[PDB]
Amino acid sequence: MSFHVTAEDARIEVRDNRTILFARLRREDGEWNDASYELDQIIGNNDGHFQWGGQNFTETAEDIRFHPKEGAAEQPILRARLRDCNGEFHDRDVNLTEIVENVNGEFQAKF
């Protein structure tokens, strides 16, 4: 059970009302380099529904927590409370690791 060796420092943060994800990534050289990339251009909130597309949903969301590995499943889910168009806020979750992948300490959006 090893999705990709192991994920360390793989957490997101709120920077300038924008989502920012940083983590140690390994390049083909076999070296581990800590990279940081804003998820604000990858994830998004649509009227309270979690829809990753490219929005600074981080400002319209709370409880900004990312877990790229869930127990033995190593399920990468992004948790965030979004506020629905009615004004109701609820926590949502989406597979962020499946959105962007590691390309030698860099990120690439598959969606």
What are the structural domains, with CATH classification, of the chain? Answer: 1-111 (2.30.60.10)
Cα angle 53, 102, 3; round to 5: 105
Indicate the burial class of 111 (C-beta count within 10 angstroms; 0-12, 13-18, 19 or more): exposed
What are the distances in angstroms from CA 49 to CA 61, 71, 94, 97?
11, 26, 10, 19
Report the C-alpha dihedral over residues 16, 111, 68, 9, rounded to 10 degrees. Answer: -40
And the tokens for 58?
Answer: 């981080």
Question: Are 50 and 82 a contacting pair, CB within 8 Å?
Answer: yes
Question: Are 75 and 87 a contacting pair, CB within 8 Å?
Answer: no
What radius of gyration do the chain's Cα atoms show? 14
Task: Name the experimental technique.
Answer: NMR
Q: Strand, helix or coil at 21?
A: strand
Sequential DSSP letters for 70-83: -TTTT--EEEEEEE
Q: Locate tokens 């506020």: which residue?
A: 83
Q: Locate tokens 């979690």: which residue?
A: 50
